[PDB]
Every structure is written in C-alpha cells, then in structure tokens.
C-alpha cells in the first residue's frame, strides 16, 4: 500500500509466478487472490 496515492491506486498486489500448478509469470488474473486478501484488496475493509 501507499496512502499518498489517490483512492484506487493506494493498494496493490504483485502476483506470484507459480500458482497451484501453472506458470503465472505472464498469465495472471484477479481470481488468484485468496478471499481474505480479496476483502482487503477491494477496500471492503481497512484491516489486513
């Protein structure tokens, strides 16, 4: 996070390069976020 950016750019995730079985170096998608970090990332809550 960085709270000096405007709302929307103040939280982000650098995805892993190796998910369950597939190589996610280039192929990433928002579905790879687990539900708890999904709640934090979409600003449904302030607490990680």
């Amino acid at each position: 996070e960085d709270n000096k950016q405007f709302f929307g750019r103040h939280r982000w995730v650098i995805y892993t390069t190796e998910m369950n079985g597939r190589d996610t170096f280039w192929d990433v998608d928002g579905s790879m976020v687990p539900p708890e970090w999904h709640r934090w990332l979409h600003c449904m809550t302030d607490d990680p």
Partner: protein, 97 residues
C-alpha cells in the same frame, strides 16, 4: 498533489482556475472503509400498548371510487378542474444566466 509546483502553475494558467483547490481524485478526505456498528432506531409502531393494528391499517381504509352521475341512475356557475395556476416568479437568486 505529487505534481511539481511549476506544473501546477502551468495547469492553473491554462485552465484559468486554481485546480489544487478542487481536485477530482480522492486522496484521504473520504470515509474509512471500516466503520463502527450502527443502532438504527425503531419506527412509531413499536409500542407495547395502545397499538391495535386496526387503528393503523391503511390498506383497509381504501374504498371503491365514489360515483358521480350514473347514467343508469338556478344560475349554476361554471367550474374548472382546479383553480388556475399562479404565474411563476423570476428567481431572485439569479434570474438570467
């Protein structure tokens, strides 16, 4: 915010206004995403006494429309459906754009 002061001056001169006063991006002045729990008061029908539903039943006070002049059954001044509307007033705030 992050813009250098020279860029802000150029923006202000080009737009003609002070942009930094009213920025269209929300930085930190908005409400927190986590809030305390609410309490949400109850309505006027939450009494424990003198609250019989028959006295506050609005659905049961509807009646079939009142019939005037069934065909199957003095000067008499002419009438209108309603009084004529008053003329509108011209906006003492700002009458002309």
């Amino acid at each position: 915010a992050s813009a250098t002061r020279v860029i802000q001056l150029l923006r202000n001169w080009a737009s003609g206004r002070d942009l930094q006063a009213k920025l269209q991006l929300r930085y930190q002045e908005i409400s927190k995403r986590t809030q305390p729990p609410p309490k949400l008061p109850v309505g006027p029908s939450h009494k424990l006494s003198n609250n019989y539903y028959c006295t506050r039943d609005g659905r049961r006070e509807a009646m079939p429309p009142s019939i005037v002049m069934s065909s199957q059954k003095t000067e008499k001044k002419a009438v209108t459906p309603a009084p004529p509307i008053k003329r509108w007033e011209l906006s003492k705030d700002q009458p002309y754009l």
